[model samples]
Target chain A: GDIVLFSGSKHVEFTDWGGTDWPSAYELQPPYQTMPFDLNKNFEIKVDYSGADIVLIFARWEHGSKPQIWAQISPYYVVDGTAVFTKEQIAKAYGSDDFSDLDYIGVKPLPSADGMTVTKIVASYTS
Target chain B: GDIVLFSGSKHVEFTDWGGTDWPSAYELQPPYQTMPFDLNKNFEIKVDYSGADIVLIFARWEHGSKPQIWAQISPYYVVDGTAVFTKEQIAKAYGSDDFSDLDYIGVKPLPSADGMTVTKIVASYTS
Candidate 1:
């Protein structure tokens, strides 16, 4: 199964990160959302940020408890393309090789001198 | 900032697994919640499941994309009073040494015959 997380035909831009390290000092102003897939299954998360590198952040709970956050950077650089979050990478960021129970998610941009825009986001999964 | 993710008072039991694997085959029926800490800073996640082992899962995103899932197991084991999701481990599981945008989270127990009870879950962060 696959889910289209975002698709921006109109284009959204984030510009200017002068002193900040693109990889380390990304900003955060998360939006709200929920996951539609089972975290235990093997899945791939894909993001298309056409002009910049960005980070993905999550807000989740432990067994119906209070929420905690987690995040990762998109390996995709400046170009009109998609960055794939591999299952191997997902397992690693997750700290285990199994299930997940996430609800909200957001995007933090590592703005560049020229800035960048995000076009689409999707998640593909297999059994 | 430190957020308590889970703190159990009454003992919750998960028994069985006569023919199943522990780390690899933990079950999932995720409850809901949100994260209280910032994913961009340094933090530690702690879980106390004194008898059996378990996995932690997250649902998050890329930029402002749709929801994605990620996970990891508690490093704590039998006789170990607490399983600490260390900063190093969090960095590893997140695939980046910094930042996370997780929204939903859950705990999947690996049932042992003797079973286990999770007494606590807390996320402590440092600037």
Candidate 2:
């Protein structure tokens, strides 16, 4: 007897970054607050931090609320201040001392997966 | 700088089953006695059992001589009474109840690895 199988594909459509109709780097700043965004909905939000460490915090709108930090490193080490973090480095940082101060953090999906729809982003740095 | 690599292949020679020259099934039976074969040496030994469960046991010739058993099942389920067992079945049987009575069986080198040079092969039947 022979085995049979079926195949299918998924289509994903994303919005252009700026009204100019061409993609351009967008920016976000400290003490940032944004409306609770629904990930189930299709949308994109880009956050560029100007040469500073930025933290984008997100939490479920429900109870037992805890803040999630998305740190954007200084532009020197990361070519684009808004550059996405590598999956390996991000997992290592999240699993180790890098994010020690964080009691709660929303896991950023693999950058390749959903790097655009970031809800809230904050930037800070040490002198 | 770019990387450079080199590759080569080794030729292997295996003997035909019988002196008649072309391959033919050969047989081995119980109370079987043979030289302590060196698996490191290349060779093949085909064992044809009319219908029997045969156990070929091996042990290091050195001190603390513990024996190893290699069981050959009957011809019905295994078409070539001398048929090679599937790696999966061998692994499962070795890992489970069927070979519980065996304390130190020379782990059959996966049949694909070394099916031919079996030095001690025996044939017996349940019924």
Candidate 3:
């Protein structure tokens, strides 16, 4: 099994006022340092947060390029608890079921959320 | 019109002997320092070489990922002259008409080529 974990208080903001702003509202600190995650296999993304609801963000990028967002996996409404996400759940939230397309994965608060701090985020893959 | 130009001598080699070797043989020196190329529109790729035939390579990548090769665009066989490639030609050679998928583009000599120096390479887009 492979794992990516981040623990601490991290801020989440909503910057999408107009189409001009990028969808991702939070910049992942110590982001997924690993290579492209394979969601074709069984994988899990868990988030522990406080103060508001949150969602996950996926991105595609290369050097000398911008982070092209694949989609935002959302609606995990429970606060101060761990919210789990799987490939099936991600596909349900986002229209595209192909998880092999994204190279970066992250977390951010939902638009309706006010001030939020992500206490923990765990992304894992298992066979 | 936006343009990408590379001039002077460069070498290309063939390393696809085993399933192990990556397809791209030549490393682009000043590679495409720009952003992801939009093949949805009309674009032109021209190459000037001084030996055997050469082919163009398109790739997809991100900061923490490897250069995933999209395909090789080839069959321009005039030594010491310029060879041109368009979206239609690329689609014909690679079988995938969608060119907007790649972020990087480069040139390399064909397998039959020996002692080839890429004299010039020009990539442009017109809207």
On lDDT, the candidate that comes out on top is 3
The TM-score, computed over Cα atoms with residue i paired to residue i, of candidate 1 is 0.37
Candidate 1 residue-wise lDDT, B4-123, digit = tens: 433333243557657453332111122222223445567666766656566665544444564354646456333357666666665566565534355444555666676556655666
After superposing candidate 3 on the true structure, give the runs of residues whose Cα lies further than 4 Å from its correct spot.
A15-33, A36-38, A59-70, A75-80, A93-97, A112-114, B1-127
Kindly give the number of clashing pairs for every candidate. Answer: 32, 5, 2
Over B1-127, each residue of candidate 2 has an lDDT whose tens digit, in order, gives 1100101111112243334422112221111211112122222223333322333222222225644444433222334445332323433434433432333322122122223332212222111
TM-score per candidate: 0.37, 0.16, 0.37
RMSD of each: 17.1, 25.9, 16.2
| Predictions in order: lDDT | 0.50, 0.26, 0.53
Per-residue CA lDDT of candidate 3, range A11-118, in tens?
A: 556534465543332333112221223457677776677655667765555435644555677744443377777766676655566655455555656554466666
Model 2: per-residue lDDT, tens digit, A1-127? 1100001111112243334322112221211211122222222223333322333232222235644444432222333444333333333434433332433222122222323332222221111
- Model 1: fraction of native contacts: 0.00
Choose 1 or 3, whichever is better by lDDT: 3
Give the Cα error of residue A18 in candidate 2, in Å.
Answer: 99
In model 3, residue pairs whose N, Cα or C atoms come closer than 3 Å (at least 3 residues apart or on different chains), thus clashing, are A61-B62, A62-B62
